[PDB]
Inverse folding.
């Protein structure tokens, strides 16, 4: 079988020979009881860069020693890409949400051998599920692999925005001091009101991490949490987003998106936010209208905006979110720390081991199986 | 009475006319039950810049309407400074740890009217306590005013170091993308081992905030915590600092912090490869060049903090540009929120002092 794996580029100075640490902290299960990936062996050392082209998710020795071929590339866009060329006979397709190879209906029609579409990470919005069903293609992902990673990124960005960390650090780097210039936009997070639009794996990990900061926690969702959990973390429920925005000092947008309406945060909806509110958006770039946010930060209606998702993606070099006032942006990297890479590389092999050996793939990994959802 | 108050400079662009928000979140007491400052009135709006010379801690109308003198200045260094010249007849001296007016024994000897040395904030290391004791000068501070602020700064700096936030943000700002350059030095904080050198108001606030991240918490101190509290956060006790270093992925130095170059080339050999240090206690707790060398060789994966030696740091201080630093200027306990609290506390203390009523017990260092 031919396995076609799309990964992002190597570092500027080349693939790393040495790393900052020797191993990763021991973790056994996710919050809720789901165990970490359980392949029968790995050919990488946890902590290596696996999501880049030279890392190959640690898969080559496993597949080549079993008679399979592995084609790794970063060229994924357009009909003339390496991906679309190798896709015609590819049995398995692997890519990450951070550098995704889209399986459009057109492309699936061209994939005459396709049997398995594997997401090295979380999310399958790049895969047309209807075409997979019609072609009996299995669609799986490594569920829960980086949910905690995203939650850490969010809490860090909340603190950085409220406390004015990034301009303050620049004063240190440029050789200045300027205490008053640092702190005239700096607040404590304590006792602020923080709300999340979804209480999933990410949203609930964020809620638990914000609690000891003595903030007032709010949330909306499709579906309420048990009042067991609402009691434990002393949460306020809102039936709609719009009911939650005006009471919140900080709003975080994560997945799952109940109603993915593009531009659901725009100039009109931003009138519902308190003056000087903060938004942290890791869900999707087009959830917020690009210029409404930029206007809001330049006018002071928003006191800060941070996130790692953009539109378009990757962002052009003059994207306003790169340099607008009081932004805490990073590239799309939050769920691909070296730690998260070890988990979804292990999960990728566990899925490939189950697939090639004819064993059942984990129930929680499956999105589409044998011609229907799973 | 003449009140001499030293504050830091206004912003480069001038004193602000408008602010990012209209008010501050309501807080009633600190962890432990101590209530926030309770002056009989404040003449400022919570959220204004009060720690700069034009902010004046909101005090001028209060002191001038009562017949007092108020001299505000930012010139505090050397014998020819406004502070040292105005100090000879000063009854009250006020300054913040972030821009401290040092009360040396020489200066205290020159202050023939001095009766109260007030810290707009926490800490009196800039005041020679023996000279204050020998001369019946009261030393007071606004206890607990910014302990939570510092603790937030520490957890924020820990996350930024482990996840490589600042180089990642720099790639975005410069127009790059470079996912692998961002994340080839980025890890999760979950399940790491984190230890603190002191479990005081700050150190214990840091521990409580790290707990839901599923880290393994360690600590040393002069006195153990109650086993009620050691349990709540699954703390591991260490009798000495040295015993704590080798098990820690992250080490934080907090006050009340051998306390002078206790982190040096010999001591750094006790740390795990890829350890992170966050130092908000004092700049000299760490040897300046031993830390930088450790970052250049890869023994340390990150160092962040807001305290330096010397202070303010000269423009070529190595900590400004060394690899994997998360430094800020000395600002962690002077957010607008903390300013509102210790400006109110400063007035509460001055009201008690001039009216002859007892100062709060928890405010007093020397009486």
């Amino acid at each position: 079988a031919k396995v076609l794996c799309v990964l992002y580029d190597d570092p500027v100075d080349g693939y790393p020979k040495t790393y900052a640490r020797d191993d990763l902290p021991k973790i056994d299960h996710y919050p809720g009881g789901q165990t970490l990936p359980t392949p029968k062996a790995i050919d990488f050392t946890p902590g290596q860069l696996l999501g880049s082209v030279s890392g190959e998710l640690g898969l080559r020795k496993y597949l080549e020693s079993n008679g399979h071929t592995l084609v790794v590339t970063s060229d994924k866009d357009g009909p003339d890409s390496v991906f679309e060329r190798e896709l015609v006979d590819a049995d398995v397709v692997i890519s990450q949400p951070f550098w995704p190879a889209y399986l459009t209906p057109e492309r699936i029609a061209k994939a005459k051998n396709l049997k398995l579409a594997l997401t090295a990470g979380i999310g399958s919005d790049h895969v047309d599920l209807q075409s997979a069903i019609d072609r009996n293609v299995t669609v799986a992902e490594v569920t829960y692999c980086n949910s905690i990673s995203v939650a850490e990124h969010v809490v860090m960005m909340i603190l950085s925005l409220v406390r004015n960390y990034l301009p303050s650090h620049e004063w240190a780097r440029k050789g200045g001091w300027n205490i008053a210039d640092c702190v005239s936009h700096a607040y404590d997070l304590e006792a602020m009101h923080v709300g999340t639009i979804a209480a999933g794996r990410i949203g609930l990990a964020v809620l638990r991490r914000l609690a000891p900061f003595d903030v007032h926690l709010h949330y909306t969702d499709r579906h309420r949490l048990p009042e067991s959990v609402e009691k434990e973390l002393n949460l306020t429920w809102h039936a709609t987003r719009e009911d939650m925005y005006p009471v919140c000092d900080v709003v975080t947008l994560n997945i799952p998106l109940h109603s993915p309406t593009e531009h659901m945060i725009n100039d009109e909806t931003l009138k519902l936010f308190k003056r000087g509110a903060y938004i942290v958006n890791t869900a999707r770039g087009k959830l917020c209208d690009r210029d409404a946010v930029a206007r809001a930060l330049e006018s002071g209606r928003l006191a800060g905006y941070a996130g790692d998702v953009w539109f378009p993606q990757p962002a052009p070099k003059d994207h306003p979110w790169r340099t607008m006032p009081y932004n805490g942006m990073t590239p799309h990297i939050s769920g691909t720390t070296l730690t998260a890479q070890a988990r979804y590389a292990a999960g990728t092999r566990e899925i490939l081991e189950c697939f090639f050996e004819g064993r059942p793939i984990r129930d929680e990994y499956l999105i589409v199986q044998g011609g229907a959802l799973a």
About this structure: Chain A has two domains: 1-145+336-374, 146-335. The longest strand of chain A covers residues 302-307.
